[PDB]
Each structure stands twice: as structure tokens, then as C-alpha cells.
């Protein structure tokens, strides 16, 4: 007698599913370089924690058409970002930060692998580039025009001259989707089936590591038991991640289960050997190379302040203090309806840096995993809904 959850043109769950009444907040934390001139001499960097810079997400569901017998549904999720000032520290258009010139590190990763090896190298020797740039916050995640990329845009007018962590993601989607609804069974409620036209990824090595399991982490199937391990496919993290049970914890009047990511999501366990994209060195525990899904950039993903990671990753940078309750990623779900109450997903973006003999802009720099910026994406269930869930 739980068919009021099922996705259909009639039930009250579709109104919740087209535009979630819960407001989602995203806050950005940058790492300011204190001693840039001393890193090139071959010394340990010192970073500083800047933020939060909080934005609010406008989540929609466009292009909806029922499929098969009504057992599947298709939609794209457009996400906008309204700037909330009262939770930020300063204006992102005025507040400057000094981080790595990531554009010129990508064009050296493109240099090797013989994308434009000859022309890229020649421009670099003619237009000297600084390893550490200084741009306003509003430019690092919402695009800024680089000299190198602009000149490459002439030869190949298919790569945009601007660069941004969230470049042109304001008001647009992140691919086509098609969801399994609940007629089949409750176990595949809002479950993921197909993404863009490939039933599974193929960036990674092993067939296991390329599989697409579970939901998109936005909703779950009802009748959640503390036995199982819920799988989640974040469209950004380039892999399917599972979250295991912790212990009981209540939010508002509702009961809830506390699901958190385990530590072998990122260790060099043999189960994750297919995730390091060259068969061999996995760069270590608590970190993941996500270069292939981005445009070849040496971007490395991890937890904020390298939580749940190795120890040489934390001492290689001054300013990294990892601890729970600050950088841990959790999801609080309702074991009855599978509807999510409170969450906090925390990702960090890094740049793998190394001294290279073929380029001066590196210098005698240490080989390390240099952090740049991280965030959480959070949601806290409103008060009026805590009373609406009633009369089972």
C-alpha cells in the first residue's frame, strides 16, 4: 500500500520530482597560496582557507517523456546558481585569490601525448607564463579568458578560450537521463539505467569499475534496511560510489539512517585498481585521478583537506587539517519512504604538479598533489514538511 511513492503523471511524488521544494546550497572554499615564490625553489607550500562563497541551486527537470509501458522516464536536470551574499564572506567579483594557472598546466599535459606538441611548445617559449596567477573568485568558477588558450583557439576553433571550474554550467544540464520508476519494483525507484547513450562508462580499465549502479544520489528506493549498501552515481565524480550504514540519528520528528562514504572508495584496494587509468600505480590511498573525464587536465579528486586519505598527502602542504564532522560526507535518509532529509556531499579539486625539465615555469617544485578548492553540497529538510509525512 505504498504505491503513492511511484513516479507517474498523477502521484504527489512527481511534483516533488520535477522541482524539489527543498533548497540546495553550494558553498565554495578556495586555498590561497601564501608563499608562491618559495614553492618554485623547492619548498613546502603554505595554503590558507578562504570562504565560504555560498550559492543556491535552482534544480529543474526539463524534457520529460514517459517510456516503455510507463516503467521508465526521461529528463534533463538544469541547475542554476543564484549568489547568496549573506552566507558568503565577500563579493566573489572583488575578492581575489592566487592559485595555480591551471590553463597552462593543461596545455603542458596536452603537449605531451602529442596533441599539438610542436606548436604548444613554441608559443610557450614566446609568451612567458607565470605558474601562479591572481584572479577574482567570480572568474575562477564562472570562466576567465586565458592568453594561451585564446591563441590555441585560432588554430582549432573548437576549444573555448575561457577557463573555469564551473564554466558555463549556469542554467544548463549535465547530459541526457532516463530513470527506472517504481512499477517494476520498489528496489529500482528513480534508479539510473542509461546516460547519454552508453549503458556504462568506458573511461576506466575493468568492466566492474565502469558500471553504472544505483541512483543519482538525489532520491532512493523505499523500505531501506540497515543491511544493504546504497549505490550512487554522481554525474561529476566519474564513477559509481556506494555508501554504507553508520548508526541511527533523527532529523526533525522523522527517524533517519545515517549513510556515509567508506574509506575504501579511495584506497588502493584491488577492488579500485581499475580506477587508476594506467594499469599500475594508483597514486595512493584517499585520492583518485579524474583526468580522463575532464579534458585531459591533471585534475585529482579527493575529500576536503584530504580526509580519509594517506598521510604524505597532508604533510606535503601547510594548512591541511582533516577531521570528521567538517569534511566527512554523509547522507541522512528516511528508512520508510526513502526520501532524503539532510545531506552534505564534500568534494575537493586538486592539480597534480611536478618539476619538469622540459619547462621552466615549474622550476624545482616538489612533486605533490596541490589543492585548489573544495565545496559541500548540502540540504536540510524544511520544517513544514516534517509534519506532512503522515498517516501511513
Amino acid at each position: 500500500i505504498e504505491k503513492k511513492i511511484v513516479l507517474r503523471n498523477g502521484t504527489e511524488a512527481f511534483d516533488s520530482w520535477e522541482k524539489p521544494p527543498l533548497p540546495v546550497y553550494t558553498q565554495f572554499y578556495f586555498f590561497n597560496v601564501t608563499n608562491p615564490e618559495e614553492i618554485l625553489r623547492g619548498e613546502t607550500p603554505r595554503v590558507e582557507e578562504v570562504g565560504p562563497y555560498t550559492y543556491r541551486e535552482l534544480r529543474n527537470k526539463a524534457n520529460i517523456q514517459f517510456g516503455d509501458n510507463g516503467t521508465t522516464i526521461s529528463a534533463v536536470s538544469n541547475k542554476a546558481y543564484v549568489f547568496e551574499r549573506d552566507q558568503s564572506v565577500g563579493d566573489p567579483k572583488i575578492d581575489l585569490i592566487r592559485t595555480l594557472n591551471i590553463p597552462v598546466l593543461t596545455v603542458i599535459e596536452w603537449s605531451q601525448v602529442h596533441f599539438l606538441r610542436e606548436i604548444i611548445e613554441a608559443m610557450l617559449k614566446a609568451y612567458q607564463q607565470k605558474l601562479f596567477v591572481t584572479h577574482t573568485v567570480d572568474e575562477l568558477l564562472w570562466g576567465y579568458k586565458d592568453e594561451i588558450l585564446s591563441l590555441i583557439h585560432v588554430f582549432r576553433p573548437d576549444i573555448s578560450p575561457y577557463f573555469g571550474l564551473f564554466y558555463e554550467k549556469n542554467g544548463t544540464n549535465d547530459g541526457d537521463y532516463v530513470f527506472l520508476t517504481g512499477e517494476d519494483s520498489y528496489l529500482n525507484f528513480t534508479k539510473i539505467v542509461e546516460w547519454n547513450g552508453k549503458t556504462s562508462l568506458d573511461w576506466w580499465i575493468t568492466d566492474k569499475c565502469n558500471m553504472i549502479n544505483g541512483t543519482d544520489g538525489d532520491s532512493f528506493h523505499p523500505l531501506i534496511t540497515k543491511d544493504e549498501v546504497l549505490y550512487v552515481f554522481p554525474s561529476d565524480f566519474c564513477r559509481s560510489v556506494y555508501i554504507t550504514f553508520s548508526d541511527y540519528e533523527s532529523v526533525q520528528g522523522l527517524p533517519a539512517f545515517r549513510y556515509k562514504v567508506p574509506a575504501e572508495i579511495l584506497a588502493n584496494t584491488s577492488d579500485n585498481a581499475g580506477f587508476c587509468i594506467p594499469e599500475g600505480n594508483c597514486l595512493g590511498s584517499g585520492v583518485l585521478n579524474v583526468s580522463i573525464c575532464k579534458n585531459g587536465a591533471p585534475i585529482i579528486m579527493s575529500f576536503p583537506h584530504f580526509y580519509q586519505a594517506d598521510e604524505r598527502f597532508v604533510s606535503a602542504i601547510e594548512g591541511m587539517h582533516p577531521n570528521q564532522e567538517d569534511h566527512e560526507t554523509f547522507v541522512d535518509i528516511n528508512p520508510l519512504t526513502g526520501i532524503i532529509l539532510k545531506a552534505a556531499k564534500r568534494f575537493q579539486i586538486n592539480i597534480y604538479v611536478k618539476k619538469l625539465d622540459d619547462f621552466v615555469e615549474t622550476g624545482d617544485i616538489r612533486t605533490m598533489v596541490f589543492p585548489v578548492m573544495y565545496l559541500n553540497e548540502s540540504v536540510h529538510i524544511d520544517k513544514e514538511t516534517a509534519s506532512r509525512l503522515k498517516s501511513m
Partner: antibody
Amino acid sequence: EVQLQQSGPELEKPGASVKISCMASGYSFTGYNMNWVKQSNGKSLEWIGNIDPYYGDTRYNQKFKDKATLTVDKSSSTAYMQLKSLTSEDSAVYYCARSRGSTSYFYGMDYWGQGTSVTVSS
Amino acid sequence: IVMTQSPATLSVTPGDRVSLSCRASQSISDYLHWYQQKSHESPRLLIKYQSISGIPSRFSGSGSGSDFTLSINSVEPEDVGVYYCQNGHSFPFTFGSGTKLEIKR
């Protein structure tokens, strides 16, 4: 292992010119400055200049400078000195050494070649 | 750019603490390099910016701006040679005159 191998000991008539070469190995020569240093018999080294083949520049000491022309180390593997207007006072040992320095700050001299004793005499 | 270092010939018993002062007319921040030359050997780097470097010994250096110092914990008979400080901050990186130490036996 950097194996900076230089060079042949030489002599020349007063007023002539001699050229030297460092011909390094074991590293990607580009982005390494390759400095030149002279040392009279009475020790007390003096730094003549560098090249830095990556950007394509030169840096010379002005008072000393008239004499030597550090031609482009030929982006292949070799260093050229080419001292001119030889004087009997220039008889000394000439060392060379690479530098990992970028722009205006010196990063020190990693490795050195054994040097060449240039004897200016007739 | 000119800089000088004192003294001009030391004698160690050996095994003693030694003070080697390098002072520059202009301020350099912390860019001193301290090279070592033996009898018939090319000079070799010891300390990069009055900070530990190289990889083969104790030698230590300190200071900031002007008036730098290189010091040895204890002297062994295989430290005989000459020592030269190096300006790093301002072109031409100007080498200083030699110290050169004799060893007492």
C-alpha cells in the same frame, strides 16, 4: 651522472680567439641556464654569464663583458664561449655549470665541468 | 652587488666550531649559496640559500638580508679547500673572494 664533459686544453697567440664547448648529458638541455665561470691562478672565481636556451636570452657582466660572446648553445647539446682579443692576463681555467633558475632569481649551480686551462702565450 | 667574506685563512685543530661570515653591501633577502672548492676539483654546491641542501654533510648556514654565516659542527681533515658565498638576488650574481682554510694537525 649529469656528466658535464668539457673540454680540450688550449693555447693561442696573443690577439687570437678560442672557442670552448661544454656538451652536457643526462638531462633535457632546455630550461637549464648553463653558466660560465672563470678562475685566475689566484682562485677567486668570477661569473661571466649564462644563456638559458628555453626563452633565448643572454646575461653578461659589463666590465668583463667586452671579451666573450656566449653564442646560442645550439639547442642540441653543446656550449660555446668564443673569447676574443686574447690578453696574457686572461690565462686562467674556465668552468661551466648548469642552473635550474627561472627569471630573476638564482637557483644555484647544480653540476660543474672540470674546466679548461686556457694559456694565452706566444 | 659587491660582497666580501672574512677571514682569509683559518686553522682548525680539528673538530671545532667554525664561523664563516659573508656580508654584502646591498641586501639580498635570503639568496646565498656557499660553494666549496678543493685542490684540483671543480667547485661544488653545499648550501642552497643558507639552508640545507646538497646531500652530503652537516654544514649549516643562517642569516637574512646581509651578514650571513656558514658554520661547521666539527671539522674533519677532508674539508680542506676554499669557500665562496654567492649573491643570488641581484644580477650579476657576484661571487665573493675566497676564504680558504688551513687544517691543523
